[PDB]
């Protein structure tokens, strides 16, 4: 092009658009910083576009969950994956219900059987913490979402809709992002005497950073490799930096390595979400 090239940031749609537009506008400019290249946000409406967006060149680099990084990386030849917050690799949902729901704490995966015939929220039909390792560990107990009250599961589309649905009754259980639902507790957007954590599952990967092949084509040679850095550079020393770091609730980006999605994409092909 005639003109200077830009670098697309997207991220899964996974809480409120507005404290997104805030993290991810943000960040754009600290990548603008340390990259000396223009960076823009641009947001996506749900999480299948982010994956399209991604694999047409619409989005450069990307914030995924576990799915929608698996299935963006199976359908875009060469995408690699760069980084993830040290909270990702050691990430859970969590199942809540509204406490007027009779649901008690669970103690056990086999505990799960308490969930038949209650109203039960999934966030986003593509979200591993809102919906794919909730319902891995269902099955394991012998739940399947057709024993749910109506004889299906509610998609909320977000980790932030999900909590919101059970806090006002609509539904009486569903499952999140562990993350998200810490920091709406600490931050006093949900009613804990409305809703109570009933279990917290095992801890699987989940978010990571995803980028398209043939950057260094666009911005020059070692361009990909500056951009891993800025991102695993980023630390709690602007207040830019500290307010991107504390929107993730991570203290740093680390490292990690495909062959660590391998348990996700097999989940994802056993409840046949990937073909
Ligand atoms: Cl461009
Ligand atoms: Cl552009
Ligand atoms: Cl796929
Ligand atoms: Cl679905
Ligand atoms: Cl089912
Ligand atoms: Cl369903
Ligand atoms: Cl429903
Ligand atoms: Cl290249
Ligand atoms: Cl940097």
Same mark, same amino acid.
């Given at each position: 092009?005639?003109? *200077?090239?830009?670098?697309?940031?997207?991220?899964?749609? %996974?809480?409120?658009?507005?404290?997104?537009?805030?993290?991810?506008?943000? &960040?754009? %400019?600290?990548?603008?910083?340390?990259?000396?290249?223009?960076?823009?946000?641009?947001?996506?409406?749900?999480?299948? #576009? $982010?994956?399209?967006?991604?694999?047409?060149?619409?989005?450069?680099?990307? +914030?995924?969950?576990? &799915?929608?990084?698996?299935?963006?990386?199976?359908?875009?030849?060469? #995408?690699?994956?760069?980084? *993830?917050? @040290?909270?990702? $690799?050691?990430?859970?949902?969590?199942?809540? #219900?509204? !406490?007027?729901?009779?649901?008690?704490?669970?103690?056990?995966?086999?505990?799960?059987?308490?969930?038949?015939?209650?109203?039960?929220?999934?966030?986003?039909?593509?979200?591993?913490?809102?919906?794919?390792?909730?319902?891995?560990?269902?099955?394991?107990?012998?739940?399947?979402?057709?024993?749910?009250?109506?004889?299906? $599961?509610?998609?909320?589309?977000?980790? @932030?809709? !999900?909590?919101?649905? /059970?806090?006002?009754? =609509?539904?009486?259980?569903?499952?999140?992002?562990?993350? /998200? +639902?810490?920091? =709406?507790?600490? @931050?006093?957007?949900?009613?804990?005497?409305?809703?109570?954590?009933? +279990?917290?599952?095992?801890?699987?990967? %989940?978010?990571? +950073?995803?980028?398209?092949?043939?950057?260094?084509?666009?911005?020059?040679?070692?361009?990909? !490799?500056?951009?891993?850095?800025?991102?695993?550079?980023?630390?709690? !020393?602007?207040?830019?930096?500290?307010?991107?770091?504390?929107?993730?609730? #991570?203290?740093?980006?680390?490292?990690?390595?495909?062959?660590?999605?391998?348990?996700?994409?097999?989940?994802?092909?056993?409840?046949?979400?990937?073909?």
């Amino acid at each position: 092009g005639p003109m *200077q090239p830009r670098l697309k940031v997207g991220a899964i749609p %996974d809480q409120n658009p507005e404290r997104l537009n805030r993290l991810y506008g943000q &960040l754009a %400019d600290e990548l603008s910083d340390r990259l000396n290249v223009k960076v823009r946000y641009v947001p996506v409406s749900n999480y299948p #576009a $982010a994956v399209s967006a991604f694999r047409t060149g619409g989005l450069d680099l990307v +914030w995924f969950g576990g &799915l929608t990084g698996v299935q963006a990386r199976l359908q875009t030849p060469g #995408a690699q994956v760069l980084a *993830q917050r @040290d909270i990702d $690799a050691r990430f859970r949902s969590v199942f809540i #219900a509204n !406490t007027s729901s009779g649901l008690q704490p669970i103690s056990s995966i086999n505990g799960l059987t308490s969930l038949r015939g209650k109203r039960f929220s999934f966030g986003s039909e593509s979200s591993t913490s809102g919906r794919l390792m909730p319902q891995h560990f269902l099955a394991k107990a012998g739940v399947t979402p057709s024993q749910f009250s109506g004889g299906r $599961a509610g998609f909320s589309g977000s980790h @932030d809709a !999900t909590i919101a649905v /059970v806090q006002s009754g =609509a539904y009486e259980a569903g499952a999140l992002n562990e993350q /998200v +639902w810490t920091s =709406a507790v600490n @931050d006093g957007r949900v009613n804990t005497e409305k809703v109570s954590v009933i +279990w917290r599952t095992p801890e699987y990967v %989940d978010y990571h +950073w995803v980028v398209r092949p043939k950057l260094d084509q666009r911005f020059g040679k070692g361009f990909t !490799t500056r951009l891993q850095k800025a991102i695993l550079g980023l630390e709690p !020393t602007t207040p830019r930096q500290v307010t991107i770091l504390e929107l993730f609730a #991570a203290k740093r980006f680390i490292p990690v390595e495909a062959s660590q999605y391998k348990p996700i994409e097999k989940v994802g092909r056993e409840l046949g979400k990937i073909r």
